[PDB]
Design a protein around this ligand. Structure first.
Ligand SMILES: Nc1noc2ccccc12
Ligand SMILES: Nc1noc2ccccc12
Ligand SMILES: Nc1noc2ccccc12
Ligand SMILES: Nc1noc2ccccc12
Lengths: 265, 266
């Protein structure tokens, strides 16, 4: 992979692996989400982030945390295909930052997918959110394009729509989901992609067999600890559309809410 | 990746990814096992296997299934490091075939790991095992070296040791493990690497925090179906710690796997 000529975005090519594909022999949405996080990490490393916190963030024990992930796939790359992904960051004032991605077929150059994410600053010890200071902002502004560059430019598009809370009883559910060591990242926290997999666990297999996932929007509210147990709830709201909720199996504390849009194969 | 000059083995280089590493910022044994299966698939594709069954196997509805996996790691590659893996197959008569792997640091060229696996032929529909026929053997012999080439050449080496059955009560356990869609392969069967992860779930976190996994041997006896629930059992059998492992169905206690692990103090 490499930073582009202007040093304001990063591109990397990936060959889809045998274990990364589903029954259609194309990459799963979890493989795509893993590749988006990989190209994001390689981008941070390439612009100087130590092995993505700035000097002032490390001093104040502050970290970036995902608030929302939104992915739209037009065509999933097949096993053996090369997919090229370009990513960049942009500040959205004191609220936080946005990381965007564009996925392309390396052979044709056509856009096969796009993604966007909202990141907020959190104190790693107290878990208190807080806005972005001018000192922190000034440290990372030099790595972002200044004119707006949006993967989702359309005025008030799917990536920015408010998501309601699923009301009991859910139409479908998958209960007692627990993370194993492979679900954790290098910091022993549950990987963000695991939550996407858990959301998808409550979609009936008949939908997965006759449809392709087109759009997924996920809000992150609270993290699942290594010893927590999760229930995944889904209700049809309609192409098929679903409303999703992940909550702790015991007291019902919300961890995530989301929506999915599926296209008939 | 590419077949070597003689066309009897295959090599591929991998850059270790950020999500593929554990708390030590080096690749997990499950990432290594996934890379071994990836280089194995690329080897089958390179020698002509359709997207690894031969013409006669497809006609008879026969497939290769793993009976045993054995992995020994000297050094786990760090995040961003390039690891080179070489793999080859050898027939072991009518019993089945063996696939071996060698892992190397691409920068130094030193051997950082090795692995070996035993594969048996099974009818896809009835699940009945069988010896390999001469017709099937003749179709894949041309892709294997004829002189023995062993990743584990040693005399009474660990890769061929018989594994006993763990007796209740287990010292440690992790109950109610279920596969999710990411645990399935392109044929909707549980991926072999998932079973390694489930075995490791019952190792106490204190061992994982103070030791590095050196050797893992796993026998495969029965597959976990998409709607089955598994219990992972572990008992210490021992600077080094050794454990005996058992995976069984949560309900009736039907064995799916048995294994052993060897851990060295960090
Ligand atoms: N999950 C991630 N997407 O982009 C990133 C950039 C730096 C670190 C983590 C990520
Ligand atoms: N990892 C990063 N690359 O560019 C950035 C700009 C702002 C915040 C983080 C990053
Ligand atoms: N899991 C595997 N290791 O090697 C292989 C070769 C062909 C197909 C599957 C595998
Ligand atoms: N996938 C394969 N590459 O070489 C082989 C030799 C024997 C059996 C299978 C394979």
């Amino acid at each position: 992979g490499s930073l582009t000529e202007d040093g304001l975005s990063y591109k990397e090519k990936f060959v889809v692996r045998s274990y990364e594909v589903g029954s259609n022999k194309t990459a799963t949405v979890e493989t795509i989400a893993n590749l988006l996080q990989e190209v994001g990490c390689n981008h941070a490393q390439s612009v100087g982030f130590s092995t993505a916190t700035t000097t002032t963030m490390r001093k104040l024990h502050l970290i970036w945390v995902t608030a929302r992930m939104h992915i739209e796939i037009y065509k999933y790359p097949a096993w053996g295909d090369v997919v090229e992904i370009e990513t960049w960051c942009q500040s959205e004032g004191r609220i936080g930052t946005r990381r965007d991605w564009i996925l392309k077929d390396s052979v044709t150059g056509e856009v096969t997918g796009r993604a966007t994410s909202k990141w907020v600053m959190m104190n790693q010890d107290t878990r208190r959110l807080q806005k972005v200071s001018d000192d922190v902002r000034d440290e990372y502004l030099v790595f972002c394009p200044q004119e707006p560059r949006l993967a989702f430019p359309e005025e008030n598009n799917r990536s920015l729509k408010k998501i309601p809370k699923l009301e009991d009883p859910a139409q479908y559910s998958m209960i007692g989901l627990k993370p194993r060591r492979a679900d954790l990242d290098m910091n022993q926290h549950v990987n963000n992609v695991t939550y996407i997999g858990w959301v998808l666990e409550s979609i009936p297999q008949e939908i997965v067999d006759t449809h392709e996932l087109q759009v997924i929007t996920l809000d992150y509210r609270r993290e699942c600890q290594q010893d927590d147990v999760v229930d995944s709830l889904t209700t049809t709201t309609s192409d098929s559309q679903f409303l999703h909720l992940l909550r702790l199996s015991g007291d019902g504390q919300e961890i995530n809410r989301g929506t999915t849009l599926w296209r008939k194969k």
